Amino acid sequence: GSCKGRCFELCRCDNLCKSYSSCCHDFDELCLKTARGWECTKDRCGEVRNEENACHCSEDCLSRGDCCTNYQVVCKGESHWVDDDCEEIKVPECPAGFVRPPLIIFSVDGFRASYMKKGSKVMPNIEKLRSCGTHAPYMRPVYPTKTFPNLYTLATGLYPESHGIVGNSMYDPVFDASFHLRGREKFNHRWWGGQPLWITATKQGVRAGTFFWSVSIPHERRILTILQWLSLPDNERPSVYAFYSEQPDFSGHKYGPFGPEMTNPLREIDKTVGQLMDGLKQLRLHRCVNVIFVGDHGMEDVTCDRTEFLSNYLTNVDDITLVPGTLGRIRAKDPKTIIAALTCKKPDQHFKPYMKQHLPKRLHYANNRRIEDIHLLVDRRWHVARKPLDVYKKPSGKCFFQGDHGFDNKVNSMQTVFVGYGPTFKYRTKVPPFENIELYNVMCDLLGLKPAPNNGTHGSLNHLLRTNTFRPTMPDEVSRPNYPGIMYLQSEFDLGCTCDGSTKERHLLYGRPAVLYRTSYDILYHTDFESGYSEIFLMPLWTSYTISKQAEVSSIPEHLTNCVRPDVRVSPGFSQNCLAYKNDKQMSYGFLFPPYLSSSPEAKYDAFLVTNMVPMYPAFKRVWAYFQRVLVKKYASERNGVNVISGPIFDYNYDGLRDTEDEIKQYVEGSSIPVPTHYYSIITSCLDFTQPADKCDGPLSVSSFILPHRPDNDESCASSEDESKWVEELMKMHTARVRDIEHLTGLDFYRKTSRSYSEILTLKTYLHTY
Numbered sequence: 188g189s190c191k192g193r194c195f196e197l198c199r200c201d202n203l204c205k206s207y208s209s210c211c212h213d214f215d216e217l218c219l220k221t222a223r224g225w226e227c228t229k230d231r232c233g234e235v236r237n238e239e240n241a242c243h244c245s246e247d248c249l250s251r252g253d254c255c256t257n258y259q260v261v262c263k264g265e266s267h268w269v270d271d272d273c274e275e276i277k278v279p280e281c282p283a284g285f286v287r288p289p290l291i292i293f294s295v296d297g298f299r300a301s302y303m304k305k306g307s308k309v310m311p312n313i314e315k316l317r318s319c320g321t322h323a324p325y326m327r328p329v330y331p332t333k334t335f336p337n338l339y340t341l342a343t344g345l346y347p348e349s350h351g352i353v354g355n356s357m358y359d360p361v362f363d364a365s366f367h368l369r370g371r372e373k374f375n376h377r378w379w380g381g382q383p384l385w386i387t388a389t390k391q392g393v394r395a396g397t398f399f400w401s402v403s404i405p406h407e408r409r410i411l412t413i414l415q416w417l418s419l420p421d422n423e424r425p426s427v428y429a430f431y432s433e434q435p436d437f438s439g440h441k442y443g444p445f446g447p448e449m450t451n452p453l454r455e456i457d458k459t460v461g462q463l464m465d466g467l468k469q470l471r472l473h474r475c476v477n478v479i480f481v482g483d484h485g486m487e488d489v490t491c492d493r494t495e496f497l498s499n500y501l502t503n504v505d506d507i508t509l510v511p512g513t514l515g516r517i518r519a520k521d522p523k524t525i526i527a528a529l530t531c532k533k534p535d536q537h538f539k540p541y542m543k544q545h546l547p548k549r550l551h552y553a554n555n556r557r558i559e560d561i562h563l564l565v566d567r568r569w570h571v572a573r574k575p576l577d578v579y580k581k582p583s584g585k586c587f588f589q590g591d592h593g594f595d596n597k598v599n600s601m602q603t604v605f606v607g608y609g610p611t612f613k614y615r616t617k618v619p620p621f622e623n624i625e626l627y628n629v630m631c632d633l634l635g636l637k638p639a640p641n642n643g644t645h646g647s648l649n650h651l652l653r654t655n656t657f658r659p660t661m662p663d664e665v666s667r668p669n670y671p672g673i674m675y676l677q678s679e680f681d682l683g684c685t686c687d688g689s690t691k692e693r694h695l696l697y698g699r700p701a702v703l704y705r706t707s708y709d710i711l712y713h714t715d716f717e718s719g720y721s722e723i724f725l726m727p728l729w730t731s732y733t734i735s736k737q738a739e740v741s742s743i744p745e746h747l748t749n750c751v752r753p754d755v756r757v758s759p760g761f762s763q764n765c766l767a768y769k770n771d772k773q774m775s776y777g778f779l780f781p782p783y784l785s786s787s788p789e790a791k792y793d794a795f796l797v798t799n800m801v802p803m804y805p806a807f808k809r810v811w812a813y814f815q816r817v818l819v820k821k822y823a824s825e826r827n828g829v830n831v832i833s834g835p836i837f838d839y840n841y842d843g844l845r846d847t848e849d850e851i852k853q854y855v856e857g858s859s860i861p862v863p864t865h866y867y868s869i870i871t872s873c874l875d876f877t878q879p880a881d882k883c884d885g886p887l888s889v890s891s892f893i894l895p896h897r898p899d900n901d902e903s904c905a906s907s908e909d910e911s912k913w914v915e916e917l918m919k920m921h922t923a924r925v926r927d928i929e930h931l932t933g934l935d936f937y938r939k940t941s942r943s944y945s946e947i948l949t950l951k952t953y954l955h956t957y
């Protein structure tokens with residue numbers, strides 16, 4: 188009936204007993220003491236223990252394990268941890284009975300990466316962690332850039348569509364229930380998928396501290412509890428801890444991210460970090476523990492003034508439910524009728540509607556029943572609401588909020604912070620930006636844990652660590668290619684078309700892609716390009732070619748515009764045919780290697796082979812022809828040549844994964860020719876642009892995209908203007924990681940380079956965001 192001698196144990200006395208309350212009567216005395224505040228005065232040094240004080244400055248406190256964190260500094264002349272110089276920590280300096288260096292996760296809500304430039308005058312402790320440890324210039328959250336999806340992504344390594352927490356608010360039709368940030372419903376385990384770090388640790392024998400705190404527990408008491416847990420005996424001491432602060436999120440919403448008011452919470456956060464680090468040094472654990480300082484998302488300038496209203500677009504908005512704000516999700520209280528009515532209606536429309544299946548694949552935001560079919564992507568700095576009355580402002584007439592977040596995760600104001608400090612991290616080291624889905628694997632490596640299956644790429648962050656790295660193994664190739672010669676006569680071919688090799692390894696710079704599923708396919712060589720041609724899908728899985736800086740673009744001759752040629756290397760039974768296209772009134776065809784870039788009049792005939800052809804809507808051909816005729820030459824001219832790999836993607840169930848043949852739902856009329864949902868291109872060059880793409884020594888440079896194969900250009904409100912005004916903007920919107928294309932294709936890229944595999948894993952997880 189009492190919490191005596193079991194405050195914050197690992198009637199309830201735990202961190203959450205207050206949350207939907209359940210604490211023993213005496214919890215607020217024994218466990219939430221507060222007298223004297225949280226720091227030692229030189230006036231109470233050597234005091235006589237008063238059991239009402241929050242923390243203690245008696246000399247028995249080091250033996251009783253309850254000093255204030257500044258006790259050695261004020262009462263024994265030691266320095267603050269922040270006043271010591273960086274000293275490289277080569278090994279963990281831990282007590283003898285420690286089996287692994289502990290991990291402390293210090294998570295900050297809404298910490299914009301830019302905040303790191305307010306400097307040591309605002310955040311000396313944080314700036315010391317950043318400069319002496321390992322830090323990225325920023326870390327990319329997942330979409331939507333909201334608190335709960337992103338904190339749970341950090342804990343699991345999973346996209347929201349997979350771990351289930353797809354928003355701060357969501358409706359689950361199978362439960363017929365709603366989930367919100369406030370309320371008891373979030374406490375029900377039915378909402379939460381994947382396997383969070385605290386569960387991974389416990390299942391593998393690694394004790395976790397309680398990661399969560401009832402809101403009425405002050406930040407100073409949370410830090411004190413973590414330090415007192417670290418002083419437990421060997422068989423009780425947890426190995427992993429978490430501290431969370433709702434700041435600077437609250438102030439960023441109220442005053443906006445550029446408000447002078449922002450330095451107040453930024454200082455209070457930095458003092459809490461100082462309290463942690465002084466406490467660790469007091470325990471002489473400051474060279475033993477790995478510390479992670481990480482944010483969930485950034486913060487953007489948003490105001491009531493900048494709101495789009497559905498009631499300006501729909502005739503009746505009272506018959507729909509809208510999840511509003513920095514994103515939109517719509518359900519009923521006709522779907523493409525609603526989409527049509529929201530599509531390009533106002534000149535500078537500050538949101539775009541999507542069926543979720545048509546969102547950029549890099550968002551990975553569709554494969555979950557809690558994600559509504561209709562999605563609105565909202566311009567940064569802007570809000571979307573159902574109707575004007577939903578915008579609440581102070582009686583002062585001023586807006587209630589000046590900052591918000593939730594936008595597309597390539598928005599620079601949404602990027603957040605990563606710093607790692609301690610024995611396992613590198614010393615005074617800066618690493619490139621990375622996505623937060625990669626962090627779960629790192630924390631597992633820091634703890635000696637085997638990660639649960641997740642969406643990180645294990646080994647892509649090895650450069651963050653000085654030890655305990657994961658050694659990735661390149662996957663074995665599963666399908667071996669055929670190399671067909673001339674096996675067939677031009678006379679054997681029906682098809683209904685008409686038409687008036689190791690030099691070729693200037694076109695395959697990084698080895699052939701490995702095919703990681705079982706299938707039959709052929710390598711085909713040509714003067715200008717190489718392809719892996721699938722006998723099952725009747726088209727290339729990949730087409731690879733190199734365009735040098737000085738390449739010339741030619742046209743498609745008038746006498747060749749409608750030319751398709753049979754390929755004598757490939758059976759007529761394993762080729763496409765032109766009858767299907769003539770009979771498919773909506774489908775045209777295009778070519779993966781562009782005829783525009785042929786090296787000679789004779790070579791160009793290769794580009795018209797039936798094995799180079801892929802099904803394309805006319806509306807998509809406007810995009811593809813512009814990319815092939817205009818943009819490839821541009822990139823090659825900018826990057827001292829480029830190597831391009833292009834191919835189809837089939838993802839009819841929108842799970843981000845290569846469809847089997849059973850899942851493909853659309854074929855060219857009267858044929859077995861499957862229709863791709865997307866087309867990809869990977870564009871590689873030398874990071875050192877003074878070396879040409881085909882003669883690159885060191886690191887590589889990549890940009891990639893996954894373009895939706897649509898029968899219209901309704902996504903592009905300016906598509907009626909010249910293609911130079913919209914096509915490249917559409918391509919930047921559909922940028923992707925090479926790793927994204929690998930999931931969607933079953934291919935494995937960059938297998939023959941002079942780079943280490945871990946370096947290559949990093950390359951494949953880069954996303955060019957512009």
Ligand SMILES: CC(C)CCC[C@@H](C)[C@H]1CC[C@H]2[C@@H]3[C@H](O)C=C4C[C@@H](O)CC[C@]4(C)[C@H]3CC[C@]12C
Pocket residue numbers: 203206373374375376377379380381382383386399400401402
């Ligand atoms: C807002 C504050 C009161 C804190 C609210 C905390 C609440 C969101 C936390 C507290 C308990 C957590 C669950 C607990 O760890 C058990 C698991 C098992 C794991 O496999 C899936 C996640 C789950 C359900 C945790 C979800 C988050 C919880 C509810």
Ligand SMILES: *[C@@H]1O[C@H](CO)[C@@H](O[C@@H]2O[C@H](CO)[C@@H](O)[C@H](O)[C@H]2NC(C)=O)[C@H](O)[C@H]1NC(C)=O
Pocket residue numbers: 345346349381551640641642842843844930
């Ligand atoms: C993200 O990672 C999860 C976990 O590995 C993947 O989800 C698994 O997908 C397989 C194959 O479809 C299923 O058999 C498992 O049941 C899934 N597990 C979970 C926890 O959902 C998911 O496919 C990955 N997403 C991407 C885009 O790669």
Ligand SMILES: CCCCCc1cc(O)c2c(c1)OC(C)(C)[C@@H]1CCC(C)=C[C@@H]21
Pocket residue numbers: 292294334335338339341342398399400429430431481
């Ligand atoms: C690795 C970065 C931190 C991960 C650990 C971590 C800590 C943490 O306190 C939370 C995490 C995850 O996610 C959920 C479960 C969404 C919590 C929601 C409610 C509150 C108050 C805090 C959140």
Ligand SMILES: [Ca+2]
Pocket residue numbers: 768769770771772773774775
């Ligand atoms: Ca046609």
Ligand SMILES: [Ca+2]
Pocket residue numbers: 837838839840841842843844845846850
């Ligand atoms: Ca799929």
Ligand code: NA
Pocket residue numbers: 375376377
């Ligand atoms: Na439940």
Ligand SMILES: [Zn+2]
Pocket residue numbers: 296297333334335436483484
């Ligand atoms: Zn947040």
Ligand SMILES: [Zn+2]
Pocket residue numbers: 297334436437440592
């Ligand atoms: Zn917020």
